Write a protein that binds this ligand. Sequence first.
Ligand SMILES: [Mg+2]
Ligand SMILES: [Mg+2]
Ligand SMILES: [Mg+2]
Ligand SMILES: [Mg+2]
Ligand SMILES: [Mg+2]
Ligand SMILES: [Mg+2]
Ligand SMILES: [Mg+2]
Ligand SMILES: [Mg+2]
Ligand SMILES: [Mg+2]
Ligand SMILES: [Mg+2]
Ligand SMILES: [Mg+2]
Ligand SMILES: [Mg+2]
Ligand SMILES: [Mg+2]
Ligand SMILES: [Mg+2]
Ligand SMILES: [Mg+2]
Ligand SMILES: [Mg+2]
Ligand SMILES: [Mg+2]
Ligand SMILES: [Mg+2]
Ligand SMILES: [Mg+2]
Ligand SMILES: [Mg+2]
Ligand SMILES: [Mg+2]
Ligand SMILES: [Mg+2]
Ligand SMILES: [Mg+2]
Ligand SMILES: [Mg+2]
Ligand SMILES: [Mg+2]
Ligand SMILES: [Mg+2]
Ligand SMILES: [Mg+2]
Ligand SMILES: [Mg+2]
Ligand SMILES: [Mg+2]
Ligand SMILES: [Mg+2]
Lengths: 205, 158, 204
Amino acid sequence: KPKLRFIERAPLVPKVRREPKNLSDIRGPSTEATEFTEGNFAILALGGGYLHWGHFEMMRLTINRSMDPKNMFAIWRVPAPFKPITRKSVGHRMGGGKGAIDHYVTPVKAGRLVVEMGGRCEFEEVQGFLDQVAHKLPFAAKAVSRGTLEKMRKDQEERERNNQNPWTFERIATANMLGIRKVLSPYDLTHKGKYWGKFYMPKRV
Amino acid sequence: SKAVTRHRRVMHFQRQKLMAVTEYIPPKPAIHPSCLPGLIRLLRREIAAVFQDNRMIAVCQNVALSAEDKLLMRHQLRKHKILMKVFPNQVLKPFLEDSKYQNLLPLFVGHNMLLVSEEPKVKEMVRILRTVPFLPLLGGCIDDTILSRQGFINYSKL
Amino acid sequence: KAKAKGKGQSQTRVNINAALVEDIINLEEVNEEMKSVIEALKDNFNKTLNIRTSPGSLDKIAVVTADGKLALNQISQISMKSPQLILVNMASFPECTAAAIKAIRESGMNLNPEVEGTLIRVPIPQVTREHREMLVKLAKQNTNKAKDSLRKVRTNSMNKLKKSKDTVSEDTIRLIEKQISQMADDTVAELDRHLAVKTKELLG
RNA sequence: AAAUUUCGGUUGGGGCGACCUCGGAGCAGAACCCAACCUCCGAGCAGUACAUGCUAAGACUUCACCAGUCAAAGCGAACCUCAAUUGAUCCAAUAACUUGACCAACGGAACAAGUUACCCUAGGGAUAACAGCGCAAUCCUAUUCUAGAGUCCAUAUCAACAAUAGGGUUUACGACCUCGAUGUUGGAUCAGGACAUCCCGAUGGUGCAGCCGCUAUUAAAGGUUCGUUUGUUCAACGAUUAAAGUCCUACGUGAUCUGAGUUCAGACCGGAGUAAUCCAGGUCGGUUUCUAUCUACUUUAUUCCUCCCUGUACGAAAGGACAAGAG
RNA sequence: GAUAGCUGGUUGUCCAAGAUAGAAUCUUAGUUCAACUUUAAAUUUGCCCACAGAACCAAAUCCCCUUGUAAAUUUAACUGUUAGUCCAAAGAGGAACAGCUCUUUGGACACUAGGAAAAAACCUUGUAGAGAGAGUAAAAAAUUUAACACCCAUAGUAGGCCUAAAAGCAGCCACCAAUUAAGAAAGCGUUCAAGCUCAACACCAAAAAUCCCAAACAUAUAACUGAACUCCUCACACCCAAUUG
Ligand SMILES: [Mg+2]
Ligand SMILES: [Mg+2]
Ligand SMILES: [Mg+2]
Ligand SMILES: [Mg+2]
Ligand SMILES: [Mg+2]
Ligand SMILES: [Mg+2]
Ligand SMILES: [Mg+2]
Ligand SMILES: [Mg+2]
Ligand SMILES: [Mg+2]
Ligand SMILES: [Mg+2]
Ligand SMILES: [Mg+2]
Ligand SMILES: [Mg+2]
Ligand SMILES: [Mg+2]
Ligand SMILES: [Mg+2]
Ligand SMILES: [Mg+2]
Ligand SMILES: [Mg+2]
Ligand SMILES: [Mg+2]
Ligand SMILES: [Mg+2]
Ligand SMILES: [Mg+2]
Ligand SMILES: [Mg+2]
Ligand SMILES: [Mg+2]
Ligand SMILES: [Mg+2]
Ligand SMILES: [Mg+2]
Ligand SMILES: [Mg+2]
Ligand SMILES: [Mg+2]
Ligand SMILES: [Mg+2]
Ligand SMILES: [Mg+2]
Ligand SMILES: [Mg+2]
Ligand SMILES: [Mg+2]
Ligand SMILES: [Mg+2]
């Protein structure tokens, strides 16, 4: 079955407890599966965000449209919708309890994979719909593969190790040079100076 | 405003100053290196074999002939005992200069269909070349000896 | 020239609130009644009388023959001969031909088919503006009847809302009333669109 | 029928809906700590003795107080479990231990209702209806990969699922100065500005044989009708010209005007209400001030119709033009 | 001379200290306690403190000797504060919007000084006067992505299944191999074949309504200018709302 299985919202067990919208699930690197698995290409998420059922449907349609059913195969790398997003009625005073359930969504972090690819095909044969879906996503995406992933990682490592700038970001954050921690965040010390809410700074060290 | 936002939140003054001061500074090459300093073996073997078996090889400039014209030429060359050859020039120039054939060096250039042979073909070839409205025979090569079309037709008369 | 007030707000209020829809009162029932009225009006329009061209249009109902239903465009290769004459080529079924003739004779088009075993001829000389105006007036009367039915439905809904008004927030009552009014306006707009389409089909 | 009184509090303005005491889970993640019109689970108790007896060093203590919690021992017999699980003063019964609350408006007046558009007064934009202001949930405009139509033909044209940029013109959303006053819509004279341009000027394509058409760019120097109704811009219709365009101007302009009604006192119609009064229900009519102080101001080419072009180019026929001059 | 949680005001000079966790209240426009602050006095430990100590279902926090210091407890008084706003992070509801409503840690504003244009909340900086003195903290935005290596075509043939038909692209199979040296065909166009290319060989981002808004220069040597911050001659009690001494 070299095709993306059908995705549907509202799981078989809709949680009734209205959980609070937490932003920590978007901040930070992709703690979940980051490397490839039983494949060769993937869609590296260069920025946090969200994914709705329509997004998954459009991605599945675009993949099934241009894809060889006897030379490639893709596997889902994101679970089904679950995060309850309670949206109040457009036109009411602030207050009066919490809104009811509206739609589910699967959060995503930076450096997370969405859909994978396999088979004895080159990266150029995928590049098309790869970059297409990447531009469709609601966050900064880009076509990435094993070789290209390793290449960009080595390039980032070389840039970090050869940075002529005697002063870096972590060296100033952890050590607290000029007491700038008052503006910085507690998570910045754990991570690097490349994150900011959800975006990603691949050019910055 | 909340921590995470759909748009790019404006960073603090000190935050922006730190981000700008902690920018990446690549190296500065003082000189930059930009301003600093298989099948070919089979081709060579075939060219050497041809040179060793070129008792009466000819050279032309067959290019204006269509596919059907080339087929008709091959049929004519099969009628009277004689074969045709088509090899590159990049791999033939080194062997040309190495075989002491200096007169043939400036000849081979661009397009040229060689016609190797062994048996006498002085009249049939002349007729096959006259049947068309072209005379690309830019001096053949018999027993490794320089000779123009005049000498060729003279030997043919004999 | 905007006249575009809040409607998506009411739609979202109706979609989100589930307990209210389950208690006050039955949005599903209201929508079902509205759709049933719309379908009844559409049937009254496309089933009373109209110069419906193309044999595929007349292909509707016919008495069961030999324990098997049948229609026009099903087994016969019909071919429009002229606007004043239609051809028929049954599949060797005199009983089905007689059944179709009987079903067509009971129509309101005032036809006089000339059957000849398997061939049928249903000519139509021409139609003047009198029949068109009569059909337009009948469609207007049917639209008025549908409007009266929607009025009765909305009156029942308002009576229910009033019965359930004491121990209920007056704001929610007013919002439900506005939603019902918007639904009635949308239904009236759909009915007017259907009437205009029917008038265009009749005259055009 | 007379005599006194009241009509408790929260509500992202007030009523309505719901709540008014206490315990636990996340917010509050590792001494304590903190918010509920943020999402939940429970209780005004439940089962055996009656040493659940009399005394008393030291402590915790719901962020105060009142109220609550643990306890070496001393005398007397031995050879309680649970998490909220509740009730202060006065007063009453009681020879006297002891007891008395859905005071739940639960730190608790001994018992008190509905309306005021007939209202008065002290104040509040701490707190509303029109604005201004900020957002852009809703809409419009442009672009990005083509999904799908368009007879072959995604990109003449329409255009789903999404993202990227501009809007505060509609509905709200927040109440930030303006309730010791910003006079509320249309309709009259006057119009200033912006083009997401209806038309007069110029181009590219076209499902351009021509007009009639469609699309994209520039051009705002100008024009943008006459009337029948409902108070309502909006809302239907008759005839015009090439067109009867959108938006901001404190829903442009009431110290220029208007009262049709929108905020008032009376009445009527149906309803709510035992009654007074009310439907944000419908109409009968409802005093519109200003004597100018200041700032500022107060005199410079557009279109349509007609004539040679006429039935021309264009076809298969119908049909039917370009420019220029003149009235 | 009523009362009134309510509007208004509450008279000369100068010095000093001087911003609050919360609870109850027929209550959140008002009152009390607590907490902050002021005066006179008796006592000794007040803060960062170092090994360690402090739970099964990340920044952190408590005690903490030497060590910097001179601050802290109590007694007796009594007025004043007990509606806050913004910024960085954890957040909570809202639309992962609002100069949107509420907490936790720090700063600022209610208190002057030098700047970011006119700014409360942003950066730097506080003990108060003179001099026609000197040295410094914060302090001036940068930047223009799109061509392209454009030479050149025999055939076992229309391979087989269905397709009256797709033979090379309605659908499936293997995809050989002769041209001297390369597709049972990667696009375009055909009902269908016809025609045109290619793979390869031979040099090869912008738009809203009064009118756009600081003049302005790429080419004389990195250092200057820039406070009430520090220093220089003198003497110093002489820059906080309410309240207090
Ligand atoms: Mg209240
Ligand atoms: Mg205590
Ligand atoms: Mg004991
Ligand atoms: Mg209590
Ligand atoms: Mg009580
Ligand atoms: Mg009372
Ligand atoms: Mg009255
Ligand atoms: Mg307003
Ligand atoms: Mg199509
Ligand atoms: Mg306000
Ligand atoms: Mg006011
Ligand atoms: Mg007032
Ligand atoms: Mg005033
Ligand atoms: Mg324009
Ligand atoms: Mg106005
Ligand atoms: Mg005026
Ligand atoms: Mg009366
Ligand atoms: Mg009567
Ligand atoms: Mg007047
Ligand atoms: Mg004057
Ligand atoms: Mg004057
Ligand atoms: Mg008094
Ligand atoms: Mg009071
Ligand atoms: Mg006052
Ligand atoms: Mg006085
Ligand atoms: Mg002081
Ligand atoms: Mg009470
Ligand atoms: Mg507020
Ligand atoms: Mg201040
Ligand atoms: Mg000083």
